[PDB]
Amino acid sequence: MLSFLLTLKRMLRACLRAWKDKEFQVLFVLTILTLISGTIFYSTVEGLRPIDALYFSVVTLTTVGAGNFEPQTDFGKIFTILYIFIGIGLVFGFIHKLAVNVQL
Amino acid sequence: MLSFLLTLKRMLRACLRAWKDKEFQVLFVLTILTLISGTIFYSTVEGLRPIDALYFSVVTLTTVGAGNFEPQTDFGKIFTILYIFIGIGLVFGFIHKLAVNVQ
Amino acid sequence: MLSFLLTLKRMLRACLRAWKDKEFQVLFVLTILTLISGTIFYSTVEGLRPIDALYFSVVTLTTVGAGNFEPQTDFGKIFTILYIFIGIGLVFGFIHKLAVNVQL
Amino acid sequence: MLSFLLTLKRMLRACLRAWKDKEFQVLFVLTILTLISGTIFYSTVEGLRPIDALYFSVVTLTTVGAGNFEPQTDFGKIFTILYIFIGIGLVFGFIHKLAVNVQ
Ligand SMILES: [Ca+2]
Ligand SMILES: [Ca+2]
Ligand code: NA
Numbered sequence: 001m002l003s004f005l006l007t008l009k010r011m012l013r014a015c016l017r018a019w020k021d022k023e024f025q026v027l028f029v030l031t032i033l034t035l036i037s038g039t040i041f042y043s044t045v046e047g048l049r050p051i052d053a054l055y056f057s058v059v060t061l062t063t064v065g066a067g068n069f070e071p072q073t074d075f076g077k078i079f080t081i082l083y084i085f086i087g088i089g090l091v092f093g094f095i096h097k098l099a100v101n102v103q104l
Numbered sequence: 105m106l107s108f109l110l111t112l113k114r115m116l117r118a119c120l121r122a123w124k125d126k127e128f129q130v131l132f133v134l135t136i137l138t139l140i141s142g143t144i145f146y147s148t149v150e151g152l153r154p155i156d157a158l159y160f161s162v163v164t165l166t167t168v169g170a171g172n173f174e175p176q177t178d179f180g181k182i183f184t185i186l187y188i189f190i191g192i193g194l195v196f197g198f199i200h201k202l203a204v205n206v207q
Numbered sequence: 208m209l210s211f212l213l214t215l216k217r218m219l220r221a222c223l224r225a226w227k228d229k230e231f232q233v234l235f236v237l238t239i240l241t242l243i244s245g246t247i248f249y250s251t252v253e254g255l256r257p258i259d260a261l262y263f264s265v266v267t268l269t270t271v272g273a274g275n276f277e278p279q280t281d282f283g284k285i286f287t288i289l290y291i292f293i294g295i296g297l298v299f300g301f302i303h304k305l306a307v308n309v310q311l
Numbered sequence: 312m313l314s315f316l317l318t319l320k321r322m323l324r325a326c327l328r329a330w331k332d333k334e335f336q337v338l339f340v341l342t343i344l345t346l347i348s349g350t351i352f353y354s355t356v357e358g359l360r361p362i363d364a365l366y367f368s369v370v371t372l373t374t375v376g377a378g379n380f381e382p383q384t385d386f387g388k389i390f391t392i393l394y395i396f397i398g399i400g401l402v403f404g405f406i407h408k409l410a411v412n413v414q
């Protein structure tokens with residue numbers, strides 16, 4: 001049990017230290033920026049209430065997927081297709097990072 | 105095929121070997137903890153039966169996605185958003201582990 | 208253009224050669240076995256038409272997600288939760304493999 | 312922050328550098344090809360407008376998932392199942408690439 005906590009602590013330190021790498025920071029900011037753009041687009045173009053635009057943006061960008069909503073306009077549909085690849089590009093970025101930071 | 109059988113067993117041994125690594129155990133406990141918290145949160149704030157709160161918690165945390173349900177309250181939606189990122193955080197954790205154990 | 212095809216060919220050979228690794232074979236068989244069990248369970252317990260039980264099994268095991276259907280019984284719900292982790296375990300398996308076969 | 316700006320630019324350079332690797336180009340062409348085929352298949356067999364066939368093709372091939380639609384015909388369902396595995400096959404491809412370029 002004490003080992004659990006010590007391991008947990010060492011791992012948490014390593015996670016917080018990751019928030020120090022400038023490339024991880026960029027990816028993070030880019031992600032926030034992407035989530036904000038999505039929130040703006042869906043509230044504007046699809047008329048979704050702000051909190052629902054972020055929710056759709058989050059579930060869509062993370063590949064979780066929305067359970068009922070889907071863009072109603074052709075403009076929304078196109079944006080979403082593009083939004084999704086941006087999301088995949090970001091994930092690969094993080095993955096590429098975790099791939100380099102491990103092989104150094 | 106004995107050959108096939110032997111390969112499976114070797115793999116299974118390597119799997120159970122991971123369930124011994126402390127870091128993997130932490131990650132595992134944390135996801136169960138996360139699943140429980142989720143099950144609790146959705147039972148309370150969204151008022152789902154426990155089994156349906158666990159289900160939504162699972163399909164949501166793993167990025168599988170629910171086919172019909174989605175948080176009705178603002179609290180539920182905000183929680184779900186953070187929940188998903190915890191899930192991503194956890195998966196990166198397991199992945200980093202799998203990329204550290206290869207070396 | 209000729210390079211495209213040559214690269215494409217070399218990559219395809221490498222993919223087919225992967226179908227030779229006994230561990231990849233096991234993971235593959237395990238996956239088929241898992242998809243068959245799912246197809247049987249959902250058709251039986253949830254009364255889904257066979258082709259729909261496989262479809263749900265596939266979209267669920269791959270994290271794609273079903274757009275409308277979800278287990279109606281508590282038995283189905285429990286099985287699905289477990290089904291999902293089996294699926295994640297298999298994915299990590301493949302990933303672990305692609306991680307070793309690259310660092311040899 | 313110039314520092315932040317410089318980091319971004321370095322990363323962007325490394326991204327465009329990948330769009331030069333032949334193997335990555337193949338993988339990319341193959342997914343576009345796959346997306347087109349999907350868009351075509353769902354337009355015909357399921358009778359969706361092209362933009363809705365592309366959308367379902369995308370959300371399906373990336374594992375994001377559609378919130379309401381799903382193939383109505385048996386042909387559509389069988390195709391979708393194989394489509395998803397092509398998608399998994401493609402992602403493993405990009406991943407293997409990202410794990411070969413690290414070394
Ligand atoms: Ca999904
Ligand atoms: Ca739905
Ligand atoms: Na997913």
Ligand code: NA
Nearest residue numbers: 063167270374
């Ligand atoms: Na995924």
Ligand code: NA
Nearest residue numbers: 065169272376
């Ligand atoms: Na869904």
